């Protein structure tokens, strides 16, 4: 009984400048695991190379709040006031240095302006002042 949901990564921003930017992204696939955990799979096209990403999120006492990379990173995935959209905010250590990231997730790949503006406001309030990058969506990635 593999409980699941398909999402699109529609926008993203961060606190530390990471000019490395995807050209395209595949659907993000969420899968429920045993022990209450939640798996996310996505592929990113950068420089004609397909990067396959899998993250396991452990659920906490608090709803919408997950830990990742063995407790070293905290991820909040909370519903947006805008329909069929969620905001992901991840603070903590990635590869040794501190970084905070935000992602807009959506059911429709077609960009929603209402959702983007909320996502902007969220980002600006947390102090993620850098440019918000909208991502293009492609069903598959190959060299």
């Amino acid at each position, epitope marked *: 009984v593999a409980v*699941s949901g398909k999402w699109y990564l529609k926008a993203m921003t961060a606190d530390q400048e990471v000019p490395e930017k995807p050209d395209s992204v595949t659907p993000m696939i969420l899968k429920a695991q045993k022990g209450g955990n939640l798996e996310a799979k996505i592929t990113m096209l950068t420089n004609g190379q397909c990067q396959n990403i899998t993250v396991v999120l452990h659920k906490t006492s608090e709803p919408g709040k997950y830990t990742a990379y063995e407790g070293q990173r905290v991820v909040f*995935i909370q519903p947006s006031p805008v329909r069929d959209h969620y905001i992901l905010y991840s603070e903590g250590e990635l590869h040794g240095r501190q970084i905070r990231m935000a992602k807009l997730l959506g059911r429709d790949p077609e960009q929603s302006q209402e959702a983007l503006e909320d996502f902007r406001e969220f980002s600006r309030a947390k102090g993620l002042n850098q440019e918000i990058l909208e991502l293009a969506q492609s069903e598959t990635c190959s060299p």
Partner: antibody
Amino acid sequence: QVQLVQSGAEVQKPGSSVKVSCKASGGTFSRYPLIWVRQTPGQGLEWMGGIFPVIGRTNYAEKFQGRVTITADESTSTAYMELNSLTSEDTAVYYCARLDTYEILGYGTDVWGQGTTVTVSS
Amino acid sequence: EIVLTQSPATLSLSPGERATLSCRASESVSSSVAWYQQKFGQAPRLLIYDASNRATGIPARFSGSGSGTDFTLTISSLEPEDFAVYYCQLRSNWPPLTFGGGTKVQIKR
């Protein structure tokens, strides 16, 4: 875990008001949608309205807008549906339900009350 | 508000046959449809949620599919207790959470 326990059955006279209750034993409905559904005898399920915390608003179906009021008291962990100007056609079973919709993906562990029968007749 | 249309309204199938119920939406509802069963004079019972996911303890026979406007409940092989009314409903953090008129699965003779 969470359990929804409704007020008992009610026989109401045309023109009156009925307020059904919905006590959540365990958990809160501060993040989860709390909805009210009814079913006219031998007819289909009708969504009346609910509390939608993600938009920070209580919303009603157009069919019921203005006759119905949905409230919640966090101290008593209870929610209420008050139907006004009852007619014989408001004879039905009223349900309250808390929907497991907050997480981006969950196990679908919704919770329904046992239902409250309201019979409108003098 | 959004309207969910369940057609056909009655389905007459023999026990053991496959059943295919439809629930079309007036607008695009993105994987936010649930399916309920309701046996005569009983409370509604959740089968499927988020269009495709099955609730706890729900036999494998029951499967949901679809996205956008057109959704489907499939019962791989009807058992005797599966003859009942099935409803589809918008089930989401965002209103409205309207219901379908329902489809009644009945014994063919």
